[PDB]
Design a protein around this ligand. Structure first.
Ligand SMILES: O=c1ccn([C@@H]2O[C@H](COP(=O)(O)O)[C@@H](O)[C@H]2O)c(=O)[nH]1
Ligand SMILES: [Mg+2]
Ligand code: NA
Length: 291
């Protein structure tokens, strides 16, 4: 039997669980199924990466570009002001997902617009990432390492910038063959200069869409009917909507901001809520018991 009270990682003060007996049953199911049944579906920004470190906010994939040498100070100022305006709406506890939706579309339209104006060169992405302040969560090496050791499919489903996310994980040495990335990927002109983005926009509140547009992937993983889903947003709860067969699914949510206002809604919607938590210790502990 799984007993959360016997697991110290689950007693940390950042760990909030509305229904601990259900979480026990789920984890029991994951352990029963083992490697052969497991797959991971995860957000990227503020889920695999840190929201803050030493009381300083850490960059998202977009911010990595916002803050880099290839963007003028005037442009950075505009982008920073856009983030102040639109992040405030993103996390606003009063607004419904449906009311936030159009503002997210608008943010990305404005943000990508400006990045295209700045003409970001493909050849500079390696340096841009290496020079940035991006930080993955504590325990990332063991998370990706254990998953690759056991050939567990990992689907990273991000509303950020795919090229940047890939370069982050490549540089951290964790972009193993079991990792599939779906995000907004840059489109480059003949000179290697940013001219637009590929495919349909993925934003905070339409991941339910892209979840259904990856059937090649999920239909090949029909046997992988036990899922661990990691997210930081209410939008992330939809990322497993394309999964072929779900037997047991555990949803772990990082709650990074507006904690008191959002705690109830997060505890109702995610099985395990990790409040202001910069490590992957809880998911790593589950994987240790499962694999
Ligand atoms: O111009 C933008 C657009 C989005 N985001 C952030 O990107 C995150 C989406 O990436 P992910 O969390 O889905 O990986 C959103 O939470 C949003 O705050 C930015 O920082 N700048
Ligand atoms: Mg996120
Ligand atoms: Na590299």
């Amino acid at each position: 039997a799984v007993h959360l009270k016997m697991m110290p990682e689950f007693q940390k003060s950042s760990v909030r669980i509305k229904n601990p007996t259900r979480v026990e049953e789920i984890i029991c199911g994951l352990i029963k199924g083992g490697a052969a049944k497991l797959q991971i579906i995860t957000d990227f920004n503020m889920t695999l990466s840190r929201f803050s470190y030493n009381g300083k906010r850490c960059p998202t994939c977009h911010n990595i570009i916002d803050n880099c040498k290839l963007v003028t100070d005037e442009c950075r100022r505009k982008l920073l002001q856009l983030k102040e305006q639109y992040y405030a709406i993103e996390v606003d506890p009063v607004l419904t997902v449906e009311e936030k939706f159009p503002y997210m579309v608008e943010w990305y339209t404005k943000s990508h617009g400006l990045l295209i104006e700045q003409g970001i060169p493909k050849a500079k992405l390696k340096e841009i990432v290496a020079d940035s302040d991006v930080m993955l969560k504590e325990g990332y090496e063991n998370f990706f390492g254990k998953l690759q050791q056991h050939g567990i499919p990992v689907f990273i489903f991000s509303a950020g910038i795919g090229d940047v996310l890939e370069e982050v994980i490549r540089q951290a040495g964790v972009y193993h063959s079991n990792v599939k990335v779906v995000s907004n990927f840059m489109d480059f002109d003949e000179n290697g200069v940013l001219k637009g983005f590929k495919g349909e926009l993925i934003h905070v509140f339409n991941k339910h869409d892209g979840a259904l547009k990856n059937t090649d992937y999920f239909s090949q993983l029909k046997d992988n009917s036990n899922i661990i889903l990691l997210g930081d947003s209410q939008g992330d709860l939809r990322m497993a909507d394309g999964v072929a067969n779900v037997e047991h699914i555990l949803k772990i949510g990082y709650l990074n901001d507006r904690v008191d206002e959002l705690l109830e809604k997060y505890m109702d919607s995610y099985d395990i809520v990790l409040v202001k938590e910069e490590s992957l210790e809880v998911v790593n502990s589950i994987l240790q018991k499962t694999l």
